[PDB]
Amino acid sequence: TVGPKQAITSEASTTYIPSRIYSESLLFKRQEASLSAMAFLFQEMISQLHRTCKTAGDFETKLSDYGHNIGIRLLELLNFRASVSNYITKMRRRDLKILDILQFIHGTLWSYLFNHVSDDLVKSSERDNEYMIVDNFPTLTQFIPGENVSCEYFVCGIIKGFLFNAGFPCGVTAHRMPQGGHSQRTVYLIQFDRQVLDREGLRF
Amino acid sequence: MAIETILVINKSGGLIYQRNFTNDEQKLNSNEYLILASTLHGVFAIASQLTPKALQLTQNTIPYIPYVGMDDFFKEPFTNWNKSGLRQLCTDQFTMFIYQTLTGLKFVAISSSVMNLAIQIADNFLRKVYCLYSDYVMKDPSYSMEMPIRSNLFDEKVKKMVENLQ
Amino acid sequence: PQYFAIIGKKDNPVYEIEFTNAENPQGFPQDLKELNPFILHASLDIVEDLQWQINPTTDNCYLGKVDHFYGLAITAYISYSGMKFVMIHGNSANSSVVIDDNNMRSFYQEVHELYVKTLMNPFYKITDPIRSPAFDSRVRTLARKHL
Amino acid sequence: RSLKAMGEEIWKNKTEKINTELFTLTYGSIVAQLCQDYERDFNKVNDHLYSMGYNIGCRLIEDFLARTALPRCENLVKTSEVLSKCAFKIFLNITPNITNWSHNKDTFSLILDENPLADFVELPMDAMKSLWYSNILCGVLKGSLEMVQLDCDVWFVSDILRGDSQTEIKVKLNRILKDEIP
Amino acid sequence: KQLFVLRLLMVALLATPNKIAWHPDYRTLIDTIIELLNINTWLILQKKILQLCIKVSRKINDFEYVAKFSSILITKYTHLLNQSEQDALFKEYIQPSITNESITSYWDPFILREVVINRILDSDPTSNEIPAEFTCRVQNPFKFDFTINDIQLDEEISEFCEIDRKAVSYSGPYNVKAESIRSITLPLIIKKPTYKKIYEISCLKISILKLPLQKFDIINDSRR
């Protein structure tokens, strides 16, 4: 009973020290787990959502909401640990262009989620506000037959959840472009809206 | 040694997977493989049932590792889960190598090579295809339990293994 | 005395506390009930103006005193997720805040650390008030040690 | 040769590593959505996490036996040693140890010093008596152990996240008398 | 900042010792200050705007808006209007409204719980003559009802039923409690013989010191 939605309390500074209850180190210890356990939890996720949903579209939106609830957490944790606690620190850039948060994703997010850095990151020549984020080998979903793409939305559900909470609202879809020796390649394309673009249209 | 037709049966029913691949021909596959898989399921229990008067112990029941395949899947000699059960069948035209797993699931490799070490390379190969079955079918969410294999990826995971064998 | 707040993106507060020096046992005479929520919502406009610009009136997470208004120095801070850490400075006379940027910037840094510790709970979703007494105990010890 | 030695050898061959923090975040999003959509009725979500864990473990045992070939555990203390020393050591990076047997050696407690399934988690106050957080392993510890025909039942007593001193799970088996004919 | 300076205008106009008549600049000022916050987020500021808007619309003496913004302050009923202190002024701004044109249907339809229509015979010689449904005989039903506001003097008067049969009532002019669920006493249906065919009823008609209003249907379901 400290902060309700009803009032504000007034208590004096330099009073007595209160009790010590719960604390934890924010910086990561290096922890590893097998790929099989997270793959088993991932297929159990897709199995339960296959069980309790009717058609493909709202299944995809529910999986994207599942990814969203990791991404909105993950933004502040990765930026605070890239600016690293009680140790004396200096905060980061807090980047605000479009072309460097995608650089931040392709550099730090994919090398945080996985051992390897993300592969390629190109724009679209035919239209602006379309950005291609591509890998060669999806390590979330390498265990499903390749003709289904909807099970690939969870990771781009992260990316929308990484982007909308960072101040750039957008929308993502994913397709599979079988280019080269990689049969599954998994393009994720990011559709922004107009109302952000003219904002950076206003900023020269 | 050389493997030419692959069969994966259920632990308690008719078979889930069958491929007569690398025989450049058409043989019949419709509805007699279910009957022959059920008779293998019966006669494994029949072949376990009769006891010759040995009454001793395992003094054994462990191969080694010939580096079959192609970082392999395992680097040490290992153990076996069918002490008193059918292990191969040997005829004029083929030898059938069978390997079951401790959960009750069995794997059948019909081999057109004709006439000890074959058991070692067979148990090594069928343990490797058990590893690819665990790593590529059991992880799949669309695959329900005790249903026919529908994965397209498991196909070129095993075709490449067989064409890496020879 | 200082009024401290953390405000959401859809203009709602998740944390609010007012802490005073013990000489004035009652703090902020008559401003506390009416003036201090309204001038904070007024300052949210200009913090929303300066969040998207590049070169201020470096590093964009901290920023100085954003306005001066009835002799009150209003100091802001912008987190990575868009949360805004507006905290005002009152006194009977005028107040100097820029000399405490050696200390108050660090105060915003570990209360940002405390907010990241709050956010990592999977049960705690955003647009929820931070109804935890442990958070109060840490932020008033940080208010004591960063006076 | 010994299981407590060769589990580390399997920990450095054909276990592709992934960060445990991602595993915690996706499990936390699962239990957060399960909390939200069941209208805060916290006794049902332990049953639903058990129903997820049964389907985890009944497919996990055929990967565990594939990655490491073992004979059947001839007594249930060897079951406790493999669950202490290779089962949770290959998949997760944790080495729990066994204590608190029943006197007829039917029941064993798996004391678990730290859980890498719940790092950042703090429970809400209304759920503080009726939600065991990391329930999912219990379904696994039914499922896998139900497929080697050790017909057991798995349940919690206490955990650190509920304010108690320690996390331990007590499992006892009922009957077996069933196995492959070979 | 426009919100703050319109608040300054309105509080400076509040504190004058003079009197001022009605003028439609006040009308457009009130609609732009209510529409300026997205009312029809933070809730304390919405309370602190319309708690001044009700005072200015009292000082102008246009009772339609003090009735309207009282029936907008009903949205913030269950928190941040404290235990009959601010609800005291929420009463004394709504009593001259309810003795005037404010005849709206008592702020919410969430009053009536699931009433039970049993009857209690006393003879074993008569039991269910015939050839879920109730099979009512010559005895009396029961209702129970609540309100949730911190105010007192919720006053039900003349509770009776719908366009159903000759089921009637007698008198109900008594009170009902502030927070609790006061069970209203015996309504005493004086039923008439009709045809066997069944048809359920949604609710019954209750006035709150007004004319008898519409349904105020039962919670969570129709509860037939």
Curated annotation (Swiss-Prot), chain B:
Localization, UniProt: Golgi apparatus, cis-Golgi network; Endoplasmic reticulum; Preautophagosomal structure
SMART domains the UniProt entry points to: Sybindin
Keyword Transmembrane set for record: no
Gene Ontology cellular component terms for the protein in this record: cytosol; endoplasmic reticulum; phagophore assembly site; TRAPP complex; TRAPPI protein complex; TRAPPII protein complex; TRAPPIII protein complex
Keyword Transport annotated: yes
Entry-linked SUPFAM superfamilies: SNARE-like
Record-linked InterPro entries: Longin-like_dom_sf, TRAPPC
Keyword terms of this UniProt record: Autophagy, Endoplasmic reticulum, ER-Golgi transport, Golgi apparatus, Transport
Gene Ontology BP annotations: chromosome organization; endoplasmic reticulum to Golgi vesicle-mediated transport; intra-Golgi vesicle-mediated transport; macroautophagy; retrograde transport, endosome to Golgi
Function: Component of the TRAPP I, TRAPP II and TRAPP III complexes which act as guanine nucleotide exchange factors (GEF) for YPT1. TRAPP I plays a key role in the late stages of endoplasmic reticulum to Golgi traffic. TRAPP II plays a role in intra-Golgi transport. TRAPP III plays a role in autophagosome formation.
Additional remarks: Present with 3130 molecules/cell in log phase SD medium.
Family stated for the protein in its record: Belongs to the TRAPP small subunits family. TRAPPC4 subfamily.
Stated name of the protein: Trafficking protein particle complex subunit 23
Species this protein is from: Saccharomyces cerevisiae (strain ATCC 204508 / S288c)
Gene name, Swiss-Prot/TrEMBL: TRS23
Swiss-Prot record, chain C:
InterPro entries for the chain: Longin-like_dom_sf, Sedlin
GO CC field: cytoplasm; cytosol; endoplasmic reticulum; nucleus; phagophore assembly site; TRAPP complex; TRAPPI protein complex; TRAPPII protein complex
Gene3D superfamilies assigned to the protein according to its UniProt record, in alphabetical order: 3.30.450.70
Alphabetically ordered keywords of this record: Autophagy, Endoplasmic reticulum, ER-Golgi transport, Golgi apparatus, Transport
One Pfam family per UniProt: Sedlin_N
Family to which this protein belongs: Belongs to the TRAPP small subunits family. Sedlin subfamily.
Name the record gives this protein: Trafficking protein particle complex subunit 20
Source organism of this protein record: Saccharomyces cerevisiae (strain ATCC 204508 / S288c)
UniProtKB/Swiss-Prot annotation, chain D:
Pfam families in the cross-refs: TRAPP (PF04051)
Subunit structure: Part of the multisubunit TRAPP (transport protein particle) I complex composed of BET3, BET5, TRS20, TRS23, TRS31 and TRS33. Part of the multisubunit TRAPP (transport protein particle) II complex composed of BET3, BET5, TRS20, TRS23, TRS31, TRS33, TRS65, TRS85, TRS120 and TRS130. Part of the multisubunit TRAPP (transport protein particle) III complex composed of BET3, BET5, TRS20, TRS23, TRS31, TRS33 and TRS85.
Keyword annotations: Autophagy, Endoplasmic reticulum, ER-Golgi transport, Golgi apparatus, Lipoprotein, Palmitate, Transport
Family: Belongs to the TRAPP small subunits family. BET3 subfamily.
More details: Present with 2370 molecules/cell in log phase SD medium.
Record-linked CDD domains: TRAPPC3_bet3 (cd14942)
Biological process, per Gene Ontology: cellular response to nitrogen starvation; cytoplasm to vacuole targeting by the Cvt pathway; endoplasmic reticulum to Golgi vesicle-mediated transport; intra-Golgi vesicle-mediated transport; macroautophagy; retrograde transport, endosome to Golgi
Name assigned to this protein: Trafficking protein particle complex subunit BET3
PANTHER family attached to this UniProt entry: TRAFFICKING PROTEIN PARTICLE COMPLEX SUBUNIT 3
Gene: BET3
Gene Ontology cellular-component terms listed: cis-Golgi network membrane; cytosol; endoplasmic reticulum; phagophore assembly site; TRAPP complex; TRAPPI protein complex; TRAPPII protein complex; TRAPPIII protein complex
S-palmitoyl cysteine lipid modification positions: 73
Major subcellular site: Golgi
UniProt-reported outcome of changing residue 73 to S: Loss of palmitoylation
From Swiss-Prot, chain E:
Additional remark text: Present with 259 molecules/cell in log phase SD medium.
Residues of the full protein shown: 529 to 821 of 1289
Family, per entry: Belongs to the TRS120 family.
Primary role: Specific subunit of the TRAPP II complex, a highly conserved vesicle tethering complex that functions in the late Golgi as a guanine nucleotide exchanger (GEF) for the Golgi YPT1 GTPase. TRS120 plays a role in the YPT GEF activity of TRAPP II in concert with the two other TRAPP II-specific subunits TRS65 and TRS130.
Taxonomic superkingdom: Eukaryota
Name assigned to this protein: Trafficking protein particle complex II-specific subunit 120
Quaternary structure (record): Part of the multisubunit TRAPP (transport protein particle) II complex composed of BET3, BET5, TRS20, TRS23, TRS31, TRS33, TRS65, TRS120 and TRS130. Interacts directly with TRS65.
Location of the protein in the cell: Golgi apparatus, cis-Golgi network
